């Protein structure tokens, strides 16, 4: 419900 | 709770302008890249615009480049899509997306047509088939029911079709025992909220 | 741009059987940190896409054990060890290693069932509609499988083209069948200078094409 991923590689 | 709520959709005249807003919450918005993605009915996912953390750098496919602008407000935590010189192919459901999350989408319809209520025509009938032709209304959507919500089994309401006139059309059919084509009434309840029209067309044989 | 291509694009699955979907990228998706940003989405009917698997093999929140992912470099596979009714929808693979973010065509997973021939009905234009100056002729193809079907319109034995539109329902939840409508539209004048109106249907469940017709004024 609250998980946030660094999805786009551009965000290191 | 990650959240992405879009707004600003609706009807736009050809060559007109529309501005999409996306309200983001539940995470540190300023740290992640964001994108607008659209989808035509029965089509695949099409990237419309991307923008990095600070934004910064943006990307647009040639499909919308020069007409569309994507921007970002890291105070409000909002994502924007400025749509200029809109054409017919811009018609789609637009999603605010973070890659790992998608909003519910907002619909954009590029058309110069005006609000119009449908004309309902009968589709006259060991099973029989009968229905209603809900023709020439604008815009989407339309609600169809049979016998005030009592007849549900065997009902097929087809997706709408955009005619050359710019007006939508659909049919709603239902198969019933042919032995009941005299001991049973069959009425389609049609509702078109935009024009506020309610039609109860009786479907008799002959 | 990184091209993502999946196979198959249409996947009917018999309930209880597993499913596989291929996905290939035109270039390696291995980023400078050793991670591979290849993902999978599921878009259930009438809904937004939801992340199913991220970085090749990692299940996102809520995703059941039957879903698994694997692959490396440019080749990747999504497996469903046993397809349930809830798994119906379109699956997209996607890469986020390169800019722009790109998607595959999408593979629509449906419920596979025995071949069912369509029931065909033809409907003449109402006298109401004819009065207003327009004629619509509707042909209904009811409860068939698979979706593949051809409908041809014939006005006085002459093959029609360019003056009809089709519309298909999504796969029914109970009987797993589709239904289709073909609407032939003509001006009132054109409709009256002809007599025989026929709808011809070709389908895998039909040995030979079936034809439902009527004569104007009966």
Numbering used by the authors:
A (entry chain A): 13 to 24
B (entry chain H): 1 to 52, 52A, 53 to 82, 82A, 82B, 82C, 83 to 95, 101 to 126, ...
C (entry chain L): 1 to 27, 27A, 27B, 27C, 27D, 27E, 28 to 213
What does the paper say about this structure?
Crenezumab’s IgG4 backbone confers reduced activation of FcγRs in comparison to IgG1 and was shown to minimize FcγR-mediated inflammatory activation of microglia – which has also been proposed to contribute to neurotoxicity – while preserving FcγR-mediated microglial phagocytosis of oligomers. The complementarity determining regions (CDRs) of crenezumab feature a very short H3 loop of 3 residues and a long L1 loop of 16 residues, thereby creating a deep paratope groove at the interface between VH and Vκ.
The fragment with residues 11–25 yielded crystals diffracting to 2.3 Å resolution. The crystal structure of CreneFab with Aβ11–25 reveals a well-defined contiguous epitope His13Aβ–Val24Aβ in an extended conformation. The Aβ peptide was engulfed in the groove in the complex structure. Toward the C-terminal end of the Aβ epitope, two negatively charged residues, Glu22Aβ and Asp23Aβ, engaged in hydrogen bonds with Ser52aHC and Gly33HC, while Glu22Aβ was also linked to CDRs H1, H2, and L3 through a cluster of five structural waters.
